Design a protein around this ligand. Structure first.
Ligand SMILES: O=c1cc[nH]c(=O)[nH]1
Length: 283
C-alpha cells in the first residue's frame, strides 16, 4: 500500500467513471492554473492595504511633489520585498493619476524571470501615449475606468515586450482616483500548462472568457469567438454564461464529432474548459 502518482501514460489507456475522472481533472487543472493567479492577487492585496493606510492625506497628492516623492520612497522597499517573493510576478508597480502628478512618478519594478532579481526602473511616461493605447498604458486606464480591482485579459505590453495578464487595484480616496497598484504575469506560464494537459486519448484544455472570446486554444485564433469557429459551439457559449452549468458535463458537436466538456471559472474570471470526444468516455 505505497501508492505512487501516475507517470508517463502508455498510448491506448464505464461512461459514468469517465465523467467522474473528467470532472476531477477539470477541478485539479483549474487549481494548478489558479496557483500563480492567487500568488499575485494575495501579494497585490497585501501591498494595497499598506499603501492606503500610509496615504493619510490624499489631498496633498494634488499640490505637493514632496508628499508624492516621500510617499513613493516609503513604498519602494515594501513593493520590492513583496514582488521579489511573489512566484510568477514579472513586474510590479504603483502609478499615479496623470492629471495632477508628474507622468513618470511612482514605481515600476521589472525582472526577466523568477530566478532573477527585480530592479527599480523609470516608470512609463503617461505624457507619451494616448489613453486608448492599451499596449503602452492599458494597465492604468482599464482598471481606473472599471472602478474596482481588475484582472486584465491578455495583452501585449510593448514597454517590456511580453504578452501578459495583470492584476491591478485602483487606489481611490473618498471616490477620487489617486493611482493604481498592480503586478503582471507572463501569459505563457498559463499556456505552457494548457499545452501539457491531456485526458483519455485526445482530450485537451483551453481558455475562454465568459462571452466565448478565446484566450488560448491550440487551433483557434486568440481573440476570436467560439461561435465563429463552428455554429455548434453556441451550446458551449451558452453554458459558459450559466453558473449552474459549471463543473457539469456539457454535450456539443464540433468538426463532425460529439464532444463532452467540463468548465470551471478561474481566479481571474477566465473559464478553463476540458474537452474530449464522446467516444473516448464510452466503454
Ligand atoms: O510604468 C509602468 C507600470 C505598469 N506597466 C508598465 O508597462 N509600465
Amino acid at each position: 500500500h505505497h501508492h505512487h502518482s501516475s507517470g508517463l501514460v502508455p498510448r491506448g489507456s464505464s461512461y459514468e467513471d469517465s465523467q467522474q475522472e473528467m470532472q476531477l481533472k477539470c477541478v485539479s487543472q483549474s487549481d494548478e492554473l489558479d496557483t500563480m493567479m492567487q500568488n499575485v492577487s494575495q501579494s497585490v492585496e497585501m501591498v494595497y492595504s499598506i499603501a492606503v493606510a500610509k496615504l493619510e492625506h490624499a489631498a496633498s497628492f494634488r499640490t505637493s511633489k514632496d508628499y508624492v516623492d516621500t510617499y513613493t520612497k516609503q513604498m519602494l522597499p515594501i513593493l520590492m520585498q513583496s514582488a521579489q517573493n511573489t512566484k510568477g510576478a514579472l513586474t510590479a508597480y504603483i502609478r499615479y493619476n496623470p492629471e495632477f502628478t508628474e507622468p513618470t512618478s511612482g514605481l515600476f519594478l521589472t525582472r526577466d524571470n523568477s530566478d532573477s532579481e527585480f530592479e527599480s526602473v523609470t516608470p512609463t511616461d503617461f505624457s507619451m501615449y494616448d489613453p486608448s493605447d492599451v499596449e503602452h498604458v492599458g494597465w492604468y486606464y482599464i482598471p481606473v475606468q472599471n472602478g474596482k480591482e481588475t484582472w486584465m485579459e491578455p495583452y501585449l505590453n510593448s514597454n517590456i515586450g511580453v504578452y501578459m495578464i495583470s492584476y491591478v487595484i485602483p487606489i481611490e480616496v473618498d471616490g477620487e482616483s489617486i493611482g493604481i497598484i498592480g503586478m503582471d504575469i507572463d501569459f505563457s506560464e498559463f499556456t505552457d500548462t494548457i499545452d501539457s494537459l491531456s485526458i483519455f486519448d485526445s482530450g485537451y484544455g483551453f481558455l475562454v472568457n465568459e462571452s466565448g472570446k478565446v484566450m488560448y486554444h491550440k487551433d483557434l485564433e486568440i481573440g476570436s469567438n467560439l461561435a465563429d469557429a463552428d455554429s455548434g459551439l453556441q451550446s458551449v457559449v451558452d453554458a459558459l454564461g450559466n453558473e449552474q452549468t459549471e463543473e457539469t458535463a456539457v454535450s456539443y458537436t464540433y468538426q463532425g464529432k460529439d464532444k463532452v466538456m467540463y468548465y470551471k471559472t478561474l481566479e481571474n474570471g477566465m473559464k478553463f474548459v476540458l474537452t474530449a470526444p464522446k467516444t473516448e468516455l464510452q466503454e
